[PDB]
Design a protein around this nucleic acid. Structure first.
Ligand SMILES: [Mg+2]
Ligand SMILES: [Mg+2]
Ligand SMILES: [Mg+2]
Ligand SMILES: [Mg+2]
Ligand SMILES: [Mg+2]
Length: 127
RNA sequence: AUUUUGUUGGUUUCUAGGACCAUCGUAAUGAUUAAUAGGGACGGUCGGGGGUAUCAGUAUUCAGUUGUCAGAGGUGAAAUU
């Protein structure tokens, strides 16, 4: 029936990656980041830039034959935040509205089972 | 050792007092509770109590292979990178 890729969306609080691979993930089909759509660093992670990034990904996906994708959303994870960035919700909605078909959706944020020391010091970063 | 038998002094048994030694007889013969103090034992437990080994887990970083291609990072905004 459909031809599935995997839309690996990495939405941090400084950028948004829309990366579509095959099922294995060893073959990259399209990787458009929110920073390729704006000329200001402060909104590389904006919802607007993620939507534009996803639309360019969907157009590239169509001409290769990818008709559906699975979604693997992730945040920065590790010792840093586990909540997804603001661009991850827009890139997901843009892909669904671009004619691409959606399969399984999963959060694949890396989560430690403890962990290493997190940056900032004992008193945190004082603002 | 007072006292003799007094004519004065020697003799060692009764004697009395210890002080002990054995036997026998008397006797209701002789050991306070177990502290809602403690200690100890014992019986099933219960704990992220300790020590010595041992076995996970993802994460972080670094490296190897792969894939694409222009940015990535970081911030209130940036720049160093
Ligand atoms: Mg400092
Ligand atoms: Mg303050
Ligand atoms: Mg008692
Ligand atoms: Mg015991
Ligand atoms: Mg019980």
């Amino acid at each position: 029936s459909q031809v599935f890729g995997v839309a690996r969306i990495f939405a941090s609080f400084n950028d948004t990656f829309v990366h579509v691979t095959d099922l294995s993930g060893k073959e990259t089909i399209a990787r458009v980041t929110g920073g390729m759509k704006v000329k200001a660093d402060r909104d590389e992670s904006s919802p607007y830039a993620a939507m534009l990034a996803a639309q360019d990904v969907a157009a590239k996906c169509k001409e290769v034959g990818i008709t559906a994708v699975h979604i693997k959303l992730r945040a920065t994870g590790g010792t840093k935040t586990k909540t997804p960035g603001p661009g991850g919700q827009s890139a997901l909605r843009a892909l669904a509205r671009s004619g691409l078909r959606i399969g399984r959706i999963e959060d694949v944020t890396p989560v430690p089972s403890x962990s290493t020391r997190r940056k900032g010091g004992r008193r945190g970063r004082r603002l």
